[PDB]
Design a protein around this ligand. Structure first.
Ligand code: RPB
Ligand code: ZN
Length: 197
């Protein structure tokens, strides 16, 4: 079902997606332990993810949410890092793998590409701060609907949870959904973290 369409660096769609990647990098409280030490990425490839069934599933649910929330899907574009990115682009998101988490900060999602807290890092060097091995992240279209505000299935009468960072100073929000149909994996981004100079 799924085809991946390569986007050219000269395409405005490539450029807008890359800019969201780069401009949402932040410093983390672990000093780079989980995701590595970097201020920007080397973008190697951006692919548009096209799948008819997963898209129709996304839009059907989006309409339901919208009608339960004064015609407002509250749709966002958010990052998702996972060792299971290949399964996600072909089979879509699945809540049973308790919710499904998404980040406004690309560098937050980058912490989860090799597993929880970075796991043991890249397969070949076992380095969580590897500047060599290629990483992959999803930039996803996400339906939040009526989102339950959390100061840091979904709560009754809500479609999602918003984790508003209270303690952290420069952190952006993180979101949780409980229905896999409320997220569509729209862009597959292949990159390296870049060593600072
Ligand atoms: C549920 N098992 C523990 C657990 C493991 C990972 C995550 C988690 N929190 C996130 C916040 C965020 F902004 C983005 C992500 C995550 C994840 C893992 C899923 N991917 C994310 O990018 C949450 C809970
Ligand atoms: Zn490596």
């Amino acid at each position: 079902g799924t085809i991946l369409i390569d986007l050219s660096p000269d395409d405005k769609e490539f450029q807008s997606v890359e800019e969201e990647m780069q401009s949402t990098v932040r410093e983390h409280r672990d000093g780079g332990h989980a995701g590595g030490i970097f201020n920007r990425y080397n973008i190697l490839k951006i692919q548009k993810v096209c799948n008819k069934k997963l898209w129709e599933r996304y839009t059907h649910r989006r309409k339901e949410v919208s009608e339960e929330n004064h015609n407002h899907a509250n749709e966002r574009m958010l990052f998702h890092g996972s060792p299971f990115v290949n399964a996600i682009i072909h089979k879509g998101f699945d809540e049973r793998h308790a919710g499904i988490y998404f980040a406004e900060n690309s560098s937050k999602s980058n912490q989860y590409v090799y597993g929880i807290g970075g796991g043991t890092g890249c397969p070949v060097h076992k380095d969580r701060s590897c500047y060599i091995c290629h990483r992959q992240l999803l930039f996803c279209r996400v339906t939040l609907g009526k989102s339950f505000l959390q100061f840091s299935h979904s709560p009754p009468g809500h479609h999602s949870v918003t984790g508003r960072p209270s303690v952290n100073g420069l952190a952006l929000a993180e979101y949780v959904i409980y229905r896999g149909e409320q997220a569509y994996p729209e862009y597959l981004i292949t990159y390296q973290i870049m060593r600072p100079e």
